[PDB]
Amino acid sequence: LTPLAYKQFIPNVAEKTLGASGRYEGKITRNSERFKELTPNYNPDIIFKDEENTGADRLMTQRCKDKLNALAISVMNQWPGVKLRVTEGWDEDGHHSEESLHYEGRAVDITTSDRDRSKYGMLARLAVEAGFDWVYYESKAHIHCSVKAENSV
Ligand SMILES: [Ca+2]
Ligand SMILES: [Ca+2]
Ligand SMILES: [Zn+2]
């Protein structure tokens, strides 16, 4: 398989387009009507940084959890002794773009547990094969992956 290049995104369209992760609905806050859309991920095969000490990095939508758990398995098989690591999941800090999918729990920023940057291009490729709807080699320090929202009723 072929790693992504720095700043490459797949599919090669903007994140919030139909063919990628789709439109932003709105920010989910902790005491909001939509907080129930988020579920915590307690997978022992994923390392969550949780530098906030709030557990926010673990909260995500069901589709996000499904793709992330699949990626966790492929990371361990690619590099024995290494695990998937999440540095950002749902965000309440306002530390992303104004309509970031992190605010809806539909995006994660990821690394490997060893923080070996030489692996990140391949990590991004694994995220694509794990089925994330948009994958962006955003920083030398992390990959940004997002998923579609569930369909309206
Ligand atoms: Ca974090
Ligand atoms: Ca955060
Ligand atoms: Zn991100």
Side-chain angles (χ1 to χ4, degrees):
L1 272 181
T2 182
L4 274 72
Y6 181 57
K7 292 298 194 172
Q8 179 172 10
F9 45 97
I10 297 180
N12 190 36
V13 293
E15 182 175 33
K16 286 168 210 174
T17 63
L18 281 218
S21 290
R23 69 178 277 286
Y24 181 73
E25 163 71 17
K27 174 173 295 185
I28 299 181
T29 65
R30 188 171 291 275
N31 205 67
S32 73
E33 313 91 320
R34 295 179 58 212
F35 189 63
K36 62 181 187 156
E37 298 182 12
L38 304 177
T39 173
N41 189 328
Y42 291 115
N43 196 337
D45 296 326
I46 302 171
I47 300 311
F48 292 84
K49 194 182 179 180
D50 195 17
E51 73 282 4
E52 298 89 342
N53 294 315
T54 56
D57 287 343
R58 294 185 181 276
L59 288 166
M60 58 193 71
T61 63
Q62 185 64 49
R63 184 172 177 86
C64 193
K65 165 185 298 185
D66 292 340
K67 306 309 186 183
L68 193 72
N69 287 343
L71 176 60
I73 291 170
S74 68
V75 169
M76 293 181 306
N77 292 332
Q78 186 78 24
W79 303 288
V82 173
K83 289 189 166 174
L84 177 67
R85 175 170 169 269
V86 172
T87 56
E88 278 293 282
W90 172 66
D91 187 41
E92 15 172 27
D93 302 297
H95 283 170
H96 302 267
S97 62
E98 294 89 342
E99 289 192 336
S100 177
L101 296 192
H102 286 279
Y103 302 147
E104 300 195 294
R106 289 167 48 203
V108 289
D109 292 334
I110 56 168
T111 72
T112 54
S113 59
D114 63 1
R115 285 142 295 174
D116 177 6
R117 295 180 175 185
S118 75
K119 295 184 174 72
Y120 295 176
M122 186 63 220
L123 178 64
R125 170 53 65 187
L126 296 175
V128 172
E129 303 305 319
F132 278 94
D133 300 292
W134 198 69
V135 177
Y136 175 31
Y137 193 158
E138 174 168 39
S139 177
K140 294 292 191 174
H142 74 263
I143 305 304
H144 169 94
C145 309
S146 61
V147 295
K148 294 170 188 296
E150 296 297 327
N151 286 353
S152 61
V153 305

